[PDB]
Each structure stands twice: as structure tokens, then as C-alpha cells.
């Protein structure tokens, strides 16, 4: 086999306050979840510095987005340099909400991946297909196009060491469709085969491919057991006490 | 004029703990014109720290926000989060958000609605591009953008918490420099629009600020224009000359 460290990210999205953040982080920290699992929280920009100062170094802190240059005339945007200046080392890039609500292109995501890695951050690039794409038989076509753009952005092959991929079944998020652990495993296996052919066997065997569909305390252990599922990028559940149980998904 | 002069400095995507400390110490120590309202619009990651550092004499603004309090909008910041950082202002509809990030008139109106509902004060930005100005569409474009902002105002009293910024996008990064006369012409047209579409009371009280190229050399001549009630400054906001621009309405 290959032994990839399990990775659980909690994407708070546009949620949090000084008061609610303190309560969530105390619960997570006091619970001491599975020591063998890497744990990340992706928090709103306005709380990045305070969350990183409060939270023990065991836990990673990510920004939920960044732009593709260090500074300039981009009112409202945040750079990797500003994320590092807040003491944080991670960023989520190409999240389905950024792609499909805010219209971020594959090429823009590739340029953000390039700039973040150049500045020394670690990145969680997100991929995934919509319902119309899946129904038209374009799951691999869409995912491979998105992966091509991320690969083009990797400055040097060694930098894959700082990448965690998240697959989002957008076709299942906010449609009546539900993705099964079997459907998750099928896509993750296809992504790993893509990495083997287009990057290297060494990168394919070491890279964490995490699942960004609906993850609950009730389904997390069955997903974790799948051989090509190396963890999660959790949405709504990341704000809830069940995030601790999801962090323990790979424990036994 | 009985409209209080208003000078905003938009840092855009610029700042660090170190550079911010130097800029804010210089601004604070300079004690610029106490009769002028001064705002700094800073990157989200520094909002809380800038508001804690700066005396209440200064306003601190976010550079953007979204149109609901919470939800599944990875990367977005709400008015509730801006208030939670101790800040009371937000810039909305900046030319960069409209023309680089594709924010629609309708979205800007919804953001204005949500920010005002949550108790923030707002700086909605309007302005026409070069192709629009050359086609004689300056007023058509500005009035379309103002219609969408007005649709977002929850109740007429809420204009008390609005400062409009006119950005001559046609002049920003086309190499062209807009004259104080060209600024005054647009500001007068916007004030007449407010008189007809809102009220004479709002038209006479609302600050219409200029967001074109403002320098130490042109700021006093712009300030003296009867319908120019201050500035939304870009690059100069990071420089010592921002203090001179804050003093534009003196003498
Ligand atoms: Cl970190
Ligand atoms: Cl490669
Ligand atoms: Cl404030
Ligand atoms: Cl009104
Ligand atoms: Cl009237
Ligand atoms: Na790695
Ligand atoms: Na669903
Ligand atoms: Na493989
Ligand atoms: Na299941
Ligand atoms: Na697994
Ligand atoms: Na303060
Ligand atoms: Na009223
Ligand atoms: Na009023
Ligand atoms: Na210019
Ligand atoms: Na004036």
C-alpha cells in the first residue's frame, strides 16, 4: 500500500463571530481528536489572525480564498502575503462557491495556486462537476480540465508536497441527488489515476484526495474506509460539535 | 456649505502589520483637519487591529461585503462580521468590484440594502468607463447605477448613512487626467438626480465624493467645487500626501 496521513478540513464559509469562534475552538481543542489526523479550519478573513493566535499549533488555519498577486489595485481582495502576515500557512482555492457563484475561471484558480505556492502557503485546490455535466457524461472531462489548470499552476514538482485536493460533488450539493461512498471512491480513484499518468506515481501515491460532499457524523467512517478517500473538506458540520466526530472518522 | 467634508483612503490590496503601523502613526500624529470626516478602508485581515489602533476620530471601512448575514459563500464577509470587528463602514460597488470581479448593479443594490439593514454606513461607488463617456452615456450609466442603489435603500432616512463616490473610470488607468471642471459637472448632475428622485433635503445634505486622481497639487481646487464634498483616494492613501488631501477643504 501507500500510507497517506488522513486530512480533515472544516470550511466555516461565511459563518463566525468572536463569541461563537471561541466556543467552537474550545470544544475542538479540548476533544483532542485522533492525533494521526491532520486537522484544518478555514475561517473568514476578519478572524484569521485571532483564530491562529487562539488555536494550538496542532491545528492548521486556512483562508477561504486569496488573489494571484502580492499587492495592488484589487479592492476587497486578500493576498498570500497578508495570510502569512496573520501567521497562517493554508488557503482553500477554487471552492465550488467561488467557481459557480463568483465566476472564478480554471485559469484564475491555476494562477492563484501558482502565487500561493510561490509565497510559501499550502493549498487545498477544489474540483468537481455540476449535475448537467455529470448527466451529460462529462465528470472526467470537467475534473481533468480543472486538474490540468491546477497542474499548470504548480511552480515545481516538489511543491505537490504542499497540495491537498478536494473533490466536491457539486451535482449532489443542493440538488435532490445524494452521493454514495461508492460514487465518492469511483471519482477519487479516477483522480488518483489522472495524477499517476499526468504527474508521477510518487505524487499519485502520496497526495491526499479529500471528499467535499455532505459529510456527517453518520456517514464519515464509511467514507474514510474507502481506499482513495484520504479525508474531508467539511461544510456546515464544521460549525457544529459533530466536527469532532468527523475528525475521528479514520480512528477505528 | 453645511455638508461636512469627507475624505476616504482606500488602501485596496495593500498592507502588512509593519507597513500599517507606520502609515497609521503618521496619519494619527498629523492630526489632519478636525472639521473633515476621515475614513480608511483596509483589507479584511487587518480590520479589527486597525479599528483598535485608530482613535474614534477616524472611521474604519471594509472594502466589500456580501448581501446576507451568514451562509454558504466561501471567501465572503458579512456586515455582521464587520460590526463584530468594531467597524461601522463599508465601500460598495468600487469600479474594481464591478469591472474586474463582475459585480452587477442589482448585486450592489442588494449589498447596500443588507449593509444598511444591519446598521452599517455605506460608500456606494458609481462611474462610467471610457467607451461609455465617448458614446455620450455618462449620465445614462451614473443614473442606472444610482437607480439600483436607491432600490437598495431600506427607508428614506437611511440616506443619512450614505456617502456617494463618483469614480471617473474613463480616466483611471487610461492615462487621461480628469479636470476639476469635469468632476463638478458630474457631481452637479448627481445632486440634481437626488433632488428629483429622493428629496431636496437628501440632495442638500448628501456628500458626493470624488474618486478620480486626487493629489496634494489638485485637492484644494477640487474641494472648492460646490458639489464636491470630499474624496475616495486610491494609491495616495498609502503615502504621506494623504494627510495633505485630508486638509484639502482648509483655506
Ligand atoms: Cl496555519
Ligand atoms: Cl507536475
Ligand atoms: Cl468605524
Ligand atoms: Cl429613497
Ligand atoms: Cl422633496
Ligand atoms: Na503533502
Ligand atoms: Na443533495
Ligand atoms: Na494510481
Ligand atoms: Na453512508
Ligand atoms: Na481512506
Ligand atoms: Na480604536
Ligand atoms: Na424613517
Ligand atoms: Na435622510
Ligand atoms: Na489616469
Ligand atoms: Na466643495
Author numbering:
A (entry chain BBB): 2 to 253
B (entry chain AAA): 3 to 253
Article excerpt on this structure:
In this study, we report the expression, purification and crystallization of FhTPI and its monoclinic structure at 1.51 Å resolution. The asymmetric unit contains two FhTPI dimers. In subunit C, several loops were built with an alternative conformation of the main chain. The main secondary structures of the FhTPI monomer are a single β-sheet (an eight-stranded barrel) and 15 α-helices, which are arranged in a α/β barrel motif. There are 27 hydrogen bonds and seven salt bridges at the dimer interface that stabilize it. Out of these interactions, of especial interest is the interaction of Lys50 and Asp51 that participate in hydrogen-bond and salt-bridge formation at the dimer interface. These two residues do not exist in the mammalian hosts of F. hepatica, where they are substituted by Asp50 and Phe51 as shown by the aligned TPI sequences. As attempts to crystallize FhTPI in complex with the potential inhibitor TCBZ did not yield any diffraction-quality crystals, the structure was used in molecular-docking experiments to locate structural differences between parasitic and mammalian host enzymes, with the aim of developing new parasite-specific inhibitors of glycolysis. In our studies, both the ‘targeted’ and ‘blind’ docking approaches identified TCBZ binding poses in a region within the dimer interface, distant from the catalytic residues.
Triosephosphate isomerase (TPI; EC 5.3.1.1) is a glycolytic enzyme which catalyses a critical step in glycolysis in which a toxic triose dihydroxyacetone phosphate (DHAP; produced by aldolase in the previous step) is reversibly converted to d-glyceraldehyde-3-phosphate (GAP; Rieder & Rose, 1959). The TPI, in most species, is a homodimer with the substrate-binding site located close to the dimer interface. Only the dimeric form of TPI is active, and disruption of the interactions forming the dimer can result in inhibition and inactivation of the enzyme. Triosephosphate isomerase (TPI) is a glycolytic enzyme that has been researched as a drug target for various parasites, including F. hepatica.
